[PDB]
Amino acid sequence: VKARQHITVRLPKKARAMIVGEITNVFKDKYPIADKLKVIPEYDVIEQDLCKLLSPGFPKQPLRVYKFGSRITGIGNRSSDLDLFVDIGNTFHTFEHRASNATVAKLRAMRKFFCDSEDWRLINFIEQARVPIIKTCHLPTGIECDICLNSMGFCNTNLLKYIFESQPLTQYMCIYVKNWLERCKLTEQISTYSITLMVIYFLQLQALLPPIAMLQIEDQAVLVGPWVVNFAQKSFSELGLQQLKATVPVIKGFLRNFFAYFAKFDYEHFLVCPYIGQANVEIAKIERMLHARYSAYVSDNPECSIQLKKPMVVQDPIQLNHNVTKAVTKYGLQTFVDYCQQTAELLE
């Protein structure tokens, strides 16, 4: 792409076949699967085996495991990983900008337990990452597990569940766009979670979802460091938000405008902002628009402000200092815009 920037990157054929093909597969086959995978017996086995394995290593330390990720929110497939947050020592409400020594120390002790155990196969141990994780395979079930010591993923999974349950069209669209991302081979640049926040933002602009900020009007906040992770589970009827019945004409119509919107989106001056949920949130004005806990945190820690000087800015609505698409390149962004344009055309 870097060469021949004047040429629209051709939509990969695998993606073209799916877009031009009936959109009914999501409505009829992939959705029932995603809904079933929110809960299955295998999840209980994994948690119980994880506790049995880790409780001896930290014997009098309190320990709780949390499920989260695509499987739990209802947009997963049978090959999806299972994300797990292991909380040792009631560290749920502690935010670490960078993984502390204790966090890396815990993860190394856990690395050893997985290697020694016959029920687990250690896959990847990553310690030089914003969120260090352990990747293992639970051999009894075959499910690959992503284990972290950070609660933020669990908190936004709870938010997504409320969004999907309140407005199922959101869930249908995320499944479609998740599959679109894989067939476009863009998963390394743009995560499933990033595209979920983009769908939520787009629906907010269609007055079908509330701004996350409007769900956090302090009456009392629950905090992970400086971040407000709880939200008011307001009925949509109270906010005048219509709950649409997801049908194939609906979904296709909103998907067309979704791809159209982000094909013409001005990524140089604006950011995807589900926190504010308003149109045309300027990169220049966003930091003034955040809540007081953010302003206090960056004032004390300026190096922890959101990374706005990147080609693509998608702000996490809870961890307000995190740009989920900070690693996207100019050519990764162009590729995504080109695919969006060609995808919008194929939906009429």
Q: Which of 140, 159, 136, 160 is nearest to 148 (CA)?
A: 136
Measured distance CA(227)–CA(320) in Å, rounded: 7
Q: Which of 87, 69, 45 is nearest to 161 (CA)?
A: 69
What order of strands is seen across the sheet that includes strand 82-88? 63-68, 82-88, 143-148, 133-138, 120-126
**N-to-C CA span, the chain:** 26
170, 172, 173, 179: CA torsion to nearest 10: 140
Measured distance CA(145)–CA(132) in Å, rounded: 14
Measured distance CA(226)–CA(273) in Å, rounded: 18
At CA 40, angle to CA 178 and CA 112, rounded to 5?
Answer: 85
Measured distance CA(132)–CA(136) in Å, rounded: 13
H helix intervals, the chain: 13-20, 24-25, 31-36, 41-54, 70-73, 101-116, 152-166, 168-183, 192-205, 248-264, 286-289, 292-300, 330-346
What is the distance of C-alpha 38 from the center of its chain? 16
What the block records as the tokens of 298 is 């960056």
Are the C-beta atoms of 338 and 8 separated by less than 8 Å?
Answer: yes
Q: What is the DSSP letter of 208?
A: S
Sort residue 89 into left (φ over 0), alpha (ψ -120 to 50) or beta. Answer: left
Measured distance CA(148)–CA(122) in Å, rounded: 14
CA distances from 177 to 26, 47, 311 (A): 10, 30, 21
Q: Where are the domains of the chain?
A: 1-348
CA distances from 199 to 34, 177, 178, 259, 336 (A): 17, 9, 11, 10, 15
Segment holding 245, helix H or strand E: none
Measured distance CA(266)–CA(284) in Å, rounded: 13
Residue 81 counted as an annotated binding residue:
yes
Tokens 């939906």 sit on residue = 347
What resolution does the deposited structure have, in angstroms? Answer: 2.0
What the block records as the tokens of 186 is 């863009």
Beta pairing partners, 63: 88
Measured distance CA(160)–CA(154) in Å, rounded: 10
Tell me which method was used to determine the 3D structure: X-ray
Are the C-beta atoms of 309 and 220 separated by less than 8 Å?
Answer: no
Are the C-beta atoms of 107 and 132 separated by less than 8 Å?
Answer: yes
Per DSSP, the residues of 261-308 read HHHH--TTTB-B-TTT--S--BTTTHHHHS-HHHHHHHHH-GGGS---
Segment holding 329, helix H or strand E: none
Measured distance CA(145)–CA(81) in Å, rounded: 6
Q: Which long-range contacts (CB under 8 A, 24 or more apart) does 64-68 make?
A: 64/92, 66/151, 66/154, 67/43, 67/154, 68/153, 68/154, 68/156, 68/157, 68/158
239, 240, 244, 250: CA torsion to nearest 10: -110
